[PDB]
Design an enzyme around this catalytic site. Structure first.
Site, short mmCIF file in Angstrom:
data_model
loop_
_atom_site.label_atom_id
_atom_site.label_comp_id
_atom_site.label_asym_id
_atom_site.label_seq_id
_atom_site.Cartn_x
_atom_site.Cartn_y
_atom_site.Cartn_z
N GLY A 1 7.97 -5.51 -3.81
CA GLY A 1 7.61 -4.78 -2.68
C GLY A 1 6.07 -4.59 -2.50
N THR A 2 5.65 -4.77 -1.21
CA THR A 2 4.21 -4.20 -1.32
C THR A 2 3.77 -2.75 -0.92
OG1 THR A 2 4.08 -4.70 0.99
CG2 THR A 2 3.92 -6.46 -0.53
N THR A 3 2.56 -2.41 -0.75
CA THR A 3 2.19 -0.93 -0.26
C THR A 3 2.39 -1.10 1.36
OG1 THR A 3 0.60 -0.97 -1.94
CG2 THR A 3 0.32 0.71 -0.14
#
Lengths: 219, 251, 251, 219, 219, 251, 219, 251
Positions: free
Chosen positions: B32-34
């Site tokens: 997952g990304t920020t």
């Protein structure tokens, strides 16, 4: 003592016999739903999926159950595959199978009649499709209009010779609201909805009162 | 043909007709990304990075981490990408199905409480390194202050939910840095463009110290994904609005 | 449609219709705050910190740790925040549902015995580091001394319950220090403002030695949450009454 | 030998036929519940949820069971989503489905008739709503008043031409207490409760004796 | 009171009695499927497997269910062993057993009649085979043609003395379309499909409208 | 005789009539080959190596890693060969059965979403070293750009799916190298022969640094397997077209 | 109203009454199976095990099920112990028990009659054995011949006084093919098989057409 | 009395009436011998050693490792002897029962796919050191080249199956050596005596470097077991043909 099916059939036919009626038809924008319904809380027409609509007549709780059963079945398919794989044909068959079983095994048959309406994707030039499923589990594929509930004969013919392609929205509302008048008085005390193919996703839209006033002709 | 859930919950249906589809029953995969969330005058917004990493490797550079869950709410999810995607999808169906059944949409809090239920189911996978944490935002239709209608809810891995009310929040590797940048450049009630600018900027600052991030990159043309929610509903921000706001930030 | 629990227990209903919702079936997450309970003339009160910590990090600074569980009782819960929240919620419904069913509320002891049942279910998660311990207070309607109607019950992780009767008690990281401060500044039967003052003060003293606490902070404007219960019922103390009493304590 | 439904229907209609009656109506403050009940231990009216009320007639244990079933269903929904997502419409539909099934499958139908009353949130200007569900699983949405139990015809009309909007509390208690008198004597030996919309949360309140004395008119 | 089987049998025979008919026959290319069907959405003929076809008459939802049941059964066998181990004989027996059980235990027998058609592998010189299964679970192995649905007697004989080996495709379509005309008008409002043995794998192909026009003779 | 799956899913049928056949219920075995996928003018293509290794040993040198799953889609699977084979087979039946039932084929996305469901079931065996990852390509019939109708979807071991849209992708031991070669020799919209040439070439470059690969070998006569998918459908490339393109690449 | 068994019995006896017949007899080589069967796809005679044969009459799907049931049961025993522990006596008893239960509990009794034939091991000088099981679960042990299906009386006697030990194969085929002729025309349109004791393992062999021509006498 | 399996699979029957008999439900025991398979003009053949070892001890010296599974196919199985024996037996019944039911035999591929199913069930015991791997050969009746009708299929422990098509293959401790000898002395289409000679020879060479083998021994009179399959069917080679061919090989 083997044709109890004749009886059960009658129990249903009679139940659907009394009680209001409904008219579903094809037109320019997509599919129109005109059903006699004094209430505003309870409904007989509803969104099935992205391009599907649902309308029924008969005993409420029963066709209501089937309504939910559809929403679920549709969502399941959409979740399991892709929203684009959800088709009217599928739910139609589904319902046909369910009612057929209910008719055969359940203690009392379902006093219901259902209509599944589909409408091509935003771009696609494909013409809307209709399906009707009956208490015994029978289905037909009408491409123009479907009548059900109460005494149909008069309303059927009233439509039989009153329907046309590309039939404008306002006109269509009339075509139907009149086919209802003649046979079985009919003020803006209805439940009207439509399956607008112009919409990109949801496609199902309910037509309020203020907007309906300017669509329902008088006698 | 089943008659559906008694509570009108698609999830609850699966729970008793297809348990296999639930999270409850089930770096070695990209994660997952920020993601950043800001509150402002009109409504709220979500902006997410595009970097999906697996180990020290970059697995994807066009990851869409923000989704429109429903007419008046969106959410981003960080952590094991695969799990995250499935989770947000189910969440969407959850909401939509409830509506098609009840004829009404769920309260924002109702929607938030559901997301918790789902996260809480992943607790097992969480404890085994496959955790995922969402960030939910929405325009609270049942709110008083039509100006404060925007809300941000953060989550636990054990299923807890929290009201943010600080104007902003983040999740994901760079979340720590991003939040600290917002602590400085974020101003309360403001333009939808001011907040969206602050967000795209915080992702820049996060990329500075977090190798798992690396937000806006003018050279390669990688720009953050965003979504705004206001009285009009939830809408996807265009790559133009993004890339443009990106260059403007640069000095 | 199910006919409900035979014992009129919402919990018991879930136990046989939705087991998944029970605790029984299920730092990596933020954890519970310090909470103090004092007995006084009128009734009893609960005051809780607002600091939620995860590791050495501060996760939240506006955590509401005290809840009104029912007309004449409230409880605070320390430990894994997520678990805690869910637990207190269920507890509330438990009580309220019983009333709507039986037409009568549960005895205070009955309410305490239920809370135990619930805590006892979390014993599995407790042993895995996700423990939570509540502190229950209430105005015993079936009491003789309308002046001693206030009661405080503490808990185990194995589901045991204990009658405090010392005038005060605490739970949470600072509990140790807080209790020791109350041992000194707490006076028996007294004003609702005297006790509320003693409480807000003990949280100050706990914050002195416990980094997981840090109660009243005049500079940032973070003040303790409180709830009082008297013959009139349970009521949330206002931020004013709190912040004011806070400044007065300072020299 | 197919219309056993006619019989079962009769068994129920007759059971509800004898036995006291109940009147639920809309007014200024919210919803009023006036039901004939000599007892003070057992009830026919109860709190359903935060803004919902429940009232029934027929065989006790049966409508009692359904009463609980509702409390539970409501709480479940509230717990699973938010207390604000609990709606009368939901429980109404729920009951409709349950009675409908009980009617069709259970050995003996439920000699019950139920009324679900809802009242908008504290602020909201929305007007209260009513629902009535019958032993066969039928529902209607009355916005003014609902009569059930015993012989309704006289009480129905007595209300039919005696009801008005914003009808004061004291007046409403009279409107109903009189519609009861005429048809089927009627001292402060009743169970009266109300769904006060002014309240912030609970909204359900039972009206005692001392407070009732000053509300029930004489003959 | 022991021969209820006679009754149930009659219920089925009569159901299949009314309603359109179907003709399946052997020829040069493989197997031809000509069935009376006004619809284009719902079908009575379908691909069973690689070299198997399925056709039925009677109550839709019922023979439809069996259709699916076949697709599944076939696929299962193919998956579990090899696509080449899937045989008409297997599905035929399968169906015979299922209908037989349904007839004996199900509340209402299945108003269905089914035909399973197989056609040798691409190379193999083996001649196509046919199977017919009836509502009571009986099967026969016709090597020339099979008639079912509606009144068969006339159509049967019309074929009985009109059939020939290596019968050209166009001719065969005629042989059948005529056997239908005489007995029970018959425009290009049918569902025609074929099991072309020339094909390497799938073997099942549906014959559209434009291609059908040039095959259906007039009266 | 069972009436089949409610969703027309062969898999779902097994799930309730023959659970044993599902992956969910169940180097020590040979493992999957390197596989490359390219997008081009007409449609898309898949090319796979033939080397199956077990330990440092070569187990097979004629492994067919690419399969035509359905009229307009093919997929290659790398990882434990045994598991891989079974997986792709089931996948095919899944698709085909759906069609024979519904009378229509599944949307490409539908097909991709199913493959995920299946991979996701193998997650247990994955975590025990028996992982497998497929690479799916197809000619999207429901696409606008009949030139961009080709699509490539990559997978996780947790069941996630990803849209490639970079023109090419790979999986398997040499995937890393192969992708890097394509980064250089791959040109967008182009001949079916240009892309097929680029692919066979990338397998050459992968063989250079990956001992688990060793693609085209003119001396032994081992050539890559390929499959192209265009508006005409999916077709197996001939050994001639391969070996020929192979020699041409060599200087 | 207690002797429904008499009825059920009749239902079966009548079903087996109509429909072709079968003759199983002992001879030099082993056991001969001559059964009237126009089909070549479906059968009435089959290999049970290594030294066991099976033949039946009545409703197909029913005796067919039992046929499989036997194959399985035999194999199970063989697998669990040793192929040499599989005996006709075992399957006979098995069948007797199954039919007996089906007769007693199943809704409709099985319109079936079964014959289990065993033949000593390659070396062993033991003479073949026969068993007959009827729809009600009765068994007998004939050592010479067994007749079943259709009208037996004439065929029975035709054999009763026409049978002999060591009866040559060709002769035996005649003995039986004639006993069939007289009573209930009889071309090489049969299903003939034999249990050749000379064989070392399988022992069951089907007699084709070309080889049959030279065995079936004319009239 | 049960009506049997819906798929006519004896195995599937056990699966639902006697699970205990299946492999799925269940050096410390003697283990499997080296087995070689060769393809030739007529059909194919299998030759197996007779040495069963347990630890460094010789457990048996007359082990029959090759079995005629069905009229046109035989198979050898190496690994835990006990498991192996049971497995091949079940496999035979599987095939035979299918025939007695369907009236037709299974396709060769069908037969191979079944063997896989069975091996795949033993995967649990495999991972615990009780693995077994079969080698299947057969005369493909549904083949074109009546000269190439012979086929050899090798297996995994995870249930994978592989088409050999190299003319020969082996399994068991000496398999490595044996295969390498065949790589040299094996000639394609040839006598049934030439291939049988090559086989018995490869077992000699395997015995040279593998102590778990020790094939032909003229002094003790221990000779390989063989089975040939041709259009006539499968037949056991006589000890004479073996011992004779054995001496002839010796210089």
């Amino acid at each position: 003592a083997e044709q109890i099916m004749r009886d059960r059939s009658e129990l249903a036919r009679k139940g659907i016999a009394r009680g209001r009626s409904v008219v579903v038809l094809t037109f320019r924008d997509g599919v129109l739903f005109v059903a006699e319904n004094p209430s505003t809380a309870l409904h007989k027409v509803s969104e099935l999926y992205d391009r599907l609509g649902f309308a029924a007549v008969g005993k409420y709780n029963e066709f209501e159950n089937l309504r939910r059963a559809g929403i679920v079945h549709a969502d399941m398919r959409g979740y399991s595959y892709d929203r684009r794989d959800v088709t009217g044909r599928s739910l139609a068959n589904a319902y046909a199978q369910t009612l057929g079983t209910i008719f055969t095994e359940q203690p009392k048959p379902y006093e219901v009649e259902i209509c599944v309406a589909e409408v091509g994707r935003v771009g696609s030039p494909k013409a809307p499709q209709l399906y009707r499923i009956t208490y015994d589990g029978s289905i037909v594929d009408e491409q123009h209009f479907v009548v059900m509930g109460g005494t149909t004969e008069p309303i059927a013919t009233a439509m039989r010779e009153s329907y046309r392609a590309d039939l404008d929205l306002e006109a269509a509302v009339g075509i139907a609201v009149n086919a209802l008048r003649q046979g079985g008085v009919d003020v803006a005390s209805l439940e009207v909805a439509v399956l607008d193919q112009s919409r990109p996703r949801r496609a199902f839209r309910r037509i309020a009162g203020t907007a309906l006033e300017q669509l329902v002709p008088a006698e | 043909l089943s008659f559906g859930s008694n509570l009108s919950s698609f999830t609850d249906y699966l729970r008793g007709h297809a348990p296999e589809l639930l999270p409850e029953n089930r770096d070695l995969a990209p994660h997952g990304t920020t993601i950043v969330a800001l509150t402002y005058k009109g409504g709220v917004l979500l902006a997410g990075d595009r970097r999906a990493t697996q180990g020290n490797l970059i697995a994807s550079r066009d990851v869409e981490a923000v989704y429109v869950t429903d007419e008046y709410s969106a959410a981003g999810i960080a952590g094991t990408a695969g799990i995250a995607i499935e989770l947000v999808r189910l969440f969407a169906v959850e909401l939509e199905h409830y509506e098609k059944i009840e004829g009404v949409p769920l309260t924002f809090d109702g929607k938030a409480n559901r997301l918790a239920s789902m996260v809480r189911g992943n607790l097992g996978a969480a404890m085994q390194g496959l955790a995922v944490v969402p960030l939910l935002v929405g325009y609270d239709l049942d709110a008083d202050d039509e100006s404060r209608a925007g809300r941000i809810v953060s989550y636990d891995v054990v299923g807890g939910r929290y009201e943010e009310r600080a104007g902003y929040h983040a999740v994901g590797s760079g979340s720590l840095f991003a939040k600290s940048a917002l602590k400085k450049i974020y101003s309360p009630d403001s333009d939808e463009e001011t907040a969206l600018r602050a967000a795209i900027e915080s992702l820049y600052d996060a990329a500075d110290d977090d190798s798992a991030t690396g937000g806006p990159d003018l050279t390669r043309g990688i720009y953050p994904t965003a979504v705004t929610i206001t009285q009009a509903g939830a809408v996807h921000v265009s790559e133009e609005t993004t890339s443009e706001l990106a260059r403007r930030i640069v000095a």
